[PDB]
């Protein structure tokens, strides 16, 4: 795909187009009889050629000021882009950032920078799960008249037995005392179910 | 010839990419007839000022009010060659096409 | 009117001690509002219509200045495509249009004020209705009939006056309906899957457990939420009610979005008024100068007027470029905030 | 041309009440939009004629040469072209019929066939309508359509159902951001 | 002609909340009032008392003077070397 570096291509394309139009502005006749100063000096007398010289100078100064304003705006945009790129480098390559959709789409694992002319290319390695399955969950478990809550996982059920597993992966395990904690009775929880706990 | 050649001339290139990529032109409806409506009056008494025997003094310059007439300045050119015919607000050839 | 020194705030003193600590026993669910501009009004300027105004003798010397009109047109098209890209990057962050399920018992939380209600057109929530009704757009860029400008000019119809000189507003790419659909899809995704749909496939999860994990993210155990779920739901409902009441009562909430279009309209109005200026000439109308003076002498006045109008157009284009840069910065900030707060839980 | 005021306008004969000493009326921009007839005592406004911008949607030149014409801010049912060899010639090309006209909130588009199907926005036009060069109409031409926001999805939300993935996929994405630009210097006396 | 617009102008006008002189003449032998680049005349009579004014520098035959008189059917405005008396009035 050749359209991957379109931004870096359009930057230098706009720069070259600005240079070309700034060169072409010299061929303009800003109210004068000719665009060449030597022709005006050789045709008209200095007292009359001074008006044409002043008109050409004003036109070229206006063109140069417009070019400089456009270059300053482009430089501000490039500075903003470079600051964003440096922040992204420092937060994705030099460490693990929890910001969503910053170091690419998905759970960012690690990044690899790549050198590019007038730019930079990041290789964001993200965590994307697939082929998920539906399971029956429960907020807590009531075995010894007390509500048992998951310490770091989530209660699941395959239809007949209850298990405990993490979020980003399906690793069902038996509900034991070290994986859950007791807090309050079973009357404060809404969808709490009855299930045995291993000791 | 066709919009393709028009946008080619606008982009100054023989190859145009996908999309508009520029603004072609602007539609401006032109006129088809002319509507002139000057006033309807009598001939202006220009002979009272030009075809005069003796004027007034410098300190007692007479001001003649002119109104309700068709000011035809073409009759003044056939007079004697004037020393200086300089207009400071208009051109001497544009008086016949303007109102006052 | 009285003069006084500004108050920096209420004076407070923390009882610092080497063996004392403060731990709260309760909490309060508060909801705050944050409004940031995303896009601006896309306008286009006609060179020969603004500088000449359908004149035969004119537009012959304007072409001798170069490609100034072409540069201004390219800048305007760049501003337009930049605003379109900002809108796309802000509102089209996701690719799946998630549909909200039928309204059931969402753990006690009532999202009727934010979910799209089919009782009103455009399929948006009453809060979005109020937000659209507060801000009054001067010109949405839609098609206007030719008969709307002819007659009944006594009203403040400056849109016709600016369009009669080549200044028209272009409509945005994404209409309000598509933005409302994107907002509804994002809301359905964040209420039915949490932050899983932003990183990958949408994983359905009950809202009570979703909020329990939200509280666990900041350091609050799940049992505290499971024992005070009704209290949290009532506090959230009361906060949403207070927010909508403040939005319906305080008209100064959308001040930034109002001032954006106000400054745009003021710039358009002053650009129109610049035509009435006399840049060293005897009159501001080119037809009067052509009918009064001869072409050899009227050329100087035409050149003066062309230079003045070109300077005015360049100043307007510079201001529009600065405003477009500010709007791009605001849209990037808004997109980052969306991706970090709605699509996930940010610790910032 | 009443009293030397020349230009281009259309008389409408509005109900403006002018005073005996007033004959000319100017707007905010000092443009005389209403004048009094010298002969008849009626009031006539000076309104500009049909004005508007035109954009030409152009596909890839290497693919085809068929292009469409868009009239921004113009209604299709009022003035499509309305010229016969004796009107304006900035664009010496006329598209009269061909079942290619379509009315949009952004203006009148000529040269595209509107279809009920929704696809991804290829060429931005305005008002959520975009154009593309599809070869499923088999002939190929430019068609107009509403942009597709994405595939319709419905989450099976339940108070006791949860989705937990059993596998994963390591995906790598690319992101390019400009860092620097071309440093150029300008000589004053040489330019 | 202007409508529903805000136009700014700079010329000789009457300042608002300005102390103006109200004459009740009744008493004769009243000197002429000065003309300070414009005058504002107003009256609410209904018996056709005031029907003319005079303007001049010295109000005599030495300099020019403007004589404006309004009759019941016509108006006469003449510029001549009128010799105004101490108390000019119409008979």
Measured between CB atoms, which of A11, A19, A104 is closest to D173? Answer: A104
A157 touches chain D (CB under 8 A): no
Do the bridges between strand A141-142 and strand A147-150 make them parallel or antiparallel, or are there none, so unpaired?
antiparallel
Cα–Cα distance, E29 to D169 (Å, whole number)? 112
Among C137, C145, B16, C76, smallest CA distance to D108 is for C145
The structure tokens 């429960």 sit at A138
In the numeric block, the tokens 């991804």 are attached to D120
C173-205 in b/e burial notation, b at 16+ Cβ within 10 A? bbbeebbbbbbbbbbbbbbbbbbbbbbbbbbbb
In whole angstroms, what is the distance from residue B90 CA to residue B67 CA? 19
Which of B75, B1, B4 lies closest to B45, judged by CA? B75
Contact present, C186 and C203 (Cβ < 8 Å)? no
Looking at beta carbons, which residues of chain E come within 8 Å of D25? Answer: 1-2
Nearest-angstrom CA–CA distance, B54 and A118? 88
| Alpha carbon of A11: minimum distance to chain C alpha carbons (Å) | 13
The conformation of residue C164, written as its DSSP 8-state character, comes to T
Which residue in chain C is spatially nearest to B10 when comparing CA positions?
C70
Which residues of C fall within a CB distance of 8 Å from A24? 66-67
Please give the residue of chain A at the shortest CA–CA distance from D172: A125
Pairing of strands A141-142, A193-194: parallel
CB pairs under 8 A between A and C: 107
| C343 Cβ contact partners less than 8 Å away, ≥ 6 residues apart | A100, A101, C93, C190, C195, C198, C199
Angle between helices C176-192 and C126-134 (to 10 degrees): 140
Give the end-to-end CA distance of chain B in Å, rounded to a whole number. Answer: 47
Q: Is C348 on the interface with E (CB under 8 A)?
A: no
B91 at C interface, C-beta within 8 A: yes
**Strand C42-45 relative to strand B69-70, pairing:** unpaired
CB pairs under 8 A between B and D: 107
CB of D55 within 8 Å of a chain B CB? The answer is yes
Q: In the structure encoding, which two tokens stand for residue A4, read together? A: 């991957």
Residue of C nearest to A147 (CA): C223
Using a CB-CB distance cutoff of 8 angstroms, which residues of chain C are in contact with residue E3? 154
Cβ <8 Å between B26 and D88 = no
Angle of CA points C308, C311, C315, to nearest 5°: 140
Question: By three-state DSSP, how is residue B99 classified?
Answer: coil
CA distance B94 to B91: 5
Across the interface, whether the CB atoms of D16 and E1 are under 8 A apart is answered yes
Got the DSSP string for C72-141?
HHHHHHHHHHHHHHHHHHHH---SEEEEPPP----TT---TTTSPPTTSGGG--HHHHHHHHHS--S---
| Touch of B by E (3+ CB pairs closer than 8 Å) | no
The residues facing C168 across adjacent strands are C44
Residue pair D170/A125 in contact (Cβ under 8 Å)? The answer is yes
D45 to chain E, any CB pair closer than 8 A? The answer is no
B43 phi and psi angles, rounded to 5 deg: -65, 140
CA distance D46 to D9: 5
Rounded Cα distance, D171 and D155, in Å: 24
Resolution to one decimal, Å: 3.8
Give the sign of the dihedral formed by CA C191, CA C196, CA C201, CA C204.
Answer: negative
Q: Tell me the C-alpha distance between C42 and C168, whole Å.
A: 9
**Rounded CA gap, B24 and C103, in Å?**
51
Query: What Å distances lie between residue E83 and B91, E6, E69, E77, E88, CA to CA?
Result: 46, 47, 15, 16, 10
Residue ranges with strand state E in D81-189:
101-104, 107-110, 113-114, 123-126, 129-134, 141-146, 151-154, 161-178
| C-alpha to C-alpha distance for A35 and C29, rounded to whole angstroms | 72
C52 vs C47: CA distance, rounded Å: 8
Structure-solving method: cryo-EM
Chain D closest-CA separation from residue B92 CA (Å) = 15
Whether D50 sits inside 8 A of B27 (CB atoms) is yes
Query: D63 forms bridges with which residues in the sheet?
Result: none
* Nearest in space to C168 (alpha carbons), one of D88, D105, D73, D130: D73
Backbone breaks in chain E after residues (C–N over 2.5 Å): 25
Of A180, A172, A185, nearest in space to A146 by CA:
A185
Chain-chain contact of C155 with E3 (C-beta, under 8 angstroms): no
Taking CB atoms and an 8 Å limit, are A15 and D182 in contact across chains? yes
- Identify whether the C-beta of residue C96 lies closer than 8 Å to the C-beta of residue C202: yes
Contact A138, A162 (CB under 8 A): yes
Q: Decide: E23 and E30 in contact? Cβ < 8 Å.
A: yes
Other beta carbons within 10 Å of B14: 8
CA atoms within 13 A on the CB side of C92: 19
DSSP D185: -
Q: Which of C64, C223, C229 comes nearest A149 by C-beta?
A: C223
**Inter-chain residue contact C294 with B94, CB threshold 8 Å:** yes
CA distances from D75 to A74, B58, C293, D105, D115 (A): 38, 68, 41, 9, 20
Least Cα separation, residue A107 to chain C (angstroms): 6
- As beta bridge partners, residue E55 has E66
Pair of tokens at residue C218: 């900041």
A122 vs D165: CB contact, 8 Å cut-off?
A: no
Q: How far apart are CA C197 and CA C178, in angstroms?
A: 20
Is the separation of the CB atoms in C207 and C106 below 8 Å? yes
Is residue D135 within 8 A of residue D170, CB to CB? The reply is: no
| Whether the Cβ atoms of residue B23 and residue D57 lie closer than 8 Å to each other | no
Distances (CA, A) of B25 to B22, C61, C138, C161, D63: 9, 19, 26, 21, 24
Q: Which residue has 């009443």 as its token pair?
A: D2
């Amino acid at each position: 795909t050749p359209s991957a570096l379109g931004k870096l291509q359009d930057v230098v394309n706009h720069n070259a187009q600005a240079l070309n139009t700034l060169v072409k502005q010299l061929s303009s006749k800003f109210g004068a009889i000719s665009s060449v100063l030597n022709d005006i000096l050789s045709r008209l007398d200095p007292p009359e050629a001074e008006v044409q010289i002043d008109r050409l100078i004003t036109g070229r100064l206006q063109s140069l000021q417009t070019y400089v304003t456009q270059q300053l705006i482009r430089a501000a945009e490039i500075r903003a882009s470079a600051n964003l790129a440096a922040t992204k480098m420092s937060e994705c390559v030099l460490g693990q950032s929890k910001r969503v959709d910053f170091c690419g789409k998905g759970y960012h694992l690690m990044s690899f920078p790549q050198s590019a002319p007038h730019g930079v290319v990041f290789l964001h390695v993200t965590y994307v799960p697939a082929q998920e399955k539906n399971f029956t969950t429960a907020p807590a478990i009531c075995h010894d008249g007390k509500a048992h809550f998951p310490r770091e996982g989530v209660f699941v059920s395959n239809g007949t037995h209850w298990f405990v597993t993490q979020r980003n992966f399906y690793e069902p395990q038996i509900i034991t005392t070290d994986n859950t904690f007791v807090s309050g009775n079973c009357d404060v929880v809404i969808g709490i179910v009855n299930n045995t706990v291993y000791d | 010839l066709d919009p393709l050649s028009e946008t080619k001339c606008t982009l100054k290139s023989f190859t145009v990419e996908k999309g508009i990529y520029q603004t072609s032109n602007f539609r401006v409806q032109p006129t088809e007839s002319i509507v002139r409506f000057p006033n309807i009056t009598n001939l202006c008494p220009f002979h009272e000022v030009f075809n005069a025997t003796t004027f007034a003094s410098v300190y007692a310059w007479n001001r003649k009010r002119i109104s309700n007439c068709v000011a035809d300045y073409s009759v003044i050119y056939n007079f004697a060659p004037f020393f200086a015919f300089k207009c400071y607000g208009v051109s001497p050839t544009k008086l016949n096409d303007l109102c006052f | 009117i009285i003069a006084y020194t500004m108050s920096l705030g209420a004076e407070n003193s923390v009882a610092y001690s080497n063996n004392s600590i403060a731990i709260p026993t309760n909490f309060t669910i508060s909801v705050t509002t944050e409004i940031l501009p995303v896009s601006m009004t896309k306008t286009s300027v006609d060179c020969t219509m603004y500088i000449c105004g359908d004149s035969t003798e004119c537009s012959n010397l304007l072409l001798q200045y170069g490609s100034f009109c072409t540069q201004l047109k390219r800048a305007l098209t760049g501003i337009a495509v930049e605003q379109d890209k900002n809108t796309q990057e802000v509102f089209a962050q996701v690719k799946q249009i998630y549909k909200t399920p039928p309204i059931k018992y969402f753990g006690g939380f009532n999202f009727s004020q934010i979910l799209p209600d089919p009782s009103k057109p455009s399929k948006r929530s009453p809060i979005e209705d109020l937000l659209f009704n507060k801000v009054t757009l001067a010109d949405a860029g839609f098609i206007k009939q030719y008969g709307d400008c002819l007659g009944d000019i006594a009203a403040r119809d400056l849109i016709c006056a600016q369009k009669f000189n080549g200044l028209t507003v272009l409509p945005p790419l994404l209409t309000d309906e598509m933005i409302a659909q994107y907002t509804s899809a994002l809301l359905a995704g964040t209420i039915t899957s949490g932050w899983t749909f932003g990183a990958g496939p949408a994983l359905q999860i009950p809202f009570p457990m979703q909020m329990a994990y939200r509280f666990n993210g900041i350091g609050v155990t799940q049992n505290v939420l499971y024992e005070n779920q009704k209290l949290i739901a009532n506090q959230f409902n009361s906060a949403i009610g207070k927010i909508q009441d403040s939005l319906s009562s305080t008209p100064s909430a959308l001040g930034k979005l109002q001032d954006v279009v106000n400054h745009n309209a003021q710039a358009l109005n002053t650009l129109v008024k610049q035509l009435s200026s006399k840049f060293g000439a005897i009159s501001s109308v080119l037809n009067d100068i052509l009918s009064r003076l001869d072409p050899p002498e009227a050329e100087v006045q035409i050149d003066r007027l062309i230079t003045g109008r070109l300077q005015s157009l360049q100043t307007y284009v510079t201001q529009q470029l600065i405003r477009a840069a500010e709007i791009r910065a605001s849209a990037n900030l808004a997109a980052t905030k969306m991706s970090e707060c709605v699509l996930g839980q940010s610790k910032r | 041309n009443f009293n030397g005021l020349t230009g281009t306008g259309v008389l409408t004969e509005s109900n403006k009440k002018f005073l005996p000493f007033q004959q000319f009326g100017r707007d905010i921009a000092d443009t005389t939009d209403a004048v009094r007839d010298p002969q008849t005592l009626e009031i006539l406004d000076i309104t500009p004629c049909s004005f508007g911008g035109v954009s030409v949607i152009t596909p890839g030149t290497n693919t085809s040469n068929q292009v469409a014409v868009l009239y921004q801010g113009v209604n299709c049912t009022e003035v499509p072209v309305a010229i016969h060899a004796d009107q304006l010639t900035p664009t010496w090309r006329v598209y009269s019929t061909g079942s290619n006209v379509f009315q949009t909130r952004a203006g009148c588009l000529i040269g595209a066939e509107y279809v009920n199907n929704s696809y991804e926005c290829d060429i931005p036009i305005g008002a959520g309508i975009c154009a593309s060069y599809q070869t499923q109409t088999a002939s190929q031409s430019i068609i107009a359509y509403t942009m597709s926001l994405g595939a319709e999805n419905s989450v099976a939300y339940s108070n006791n159902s949860i989705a937990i993935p059993t596998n994963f996929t390591i995906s790598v994405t690319t992101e390019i951001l400009p860092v620097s630009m071309t440093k150029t210097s300008v000589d004053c006396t040489m330019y | 002609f202007r409508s529903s617009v805000l136009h700014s102008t700079h010329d000789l006008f009457l300042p608002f909340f300005s102390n103006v002189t109200w004459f009740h003449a009744k008493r004769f032998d009243n000197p002429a009032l000065p003309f300070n680049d414009g005058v504002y005349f107003a009256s609410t009579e209904k018996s056709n008392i005031i029907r003319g004014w005079i303007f001049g520098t010295t109000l005599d035959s030495k300099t020019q003077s403007l004589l404006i008189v309004n009759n019941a059917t016509n108006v006469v405005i003449k510029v001549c070397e009128f010799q105004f008396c101490n108390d000019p009035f119409l008979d």
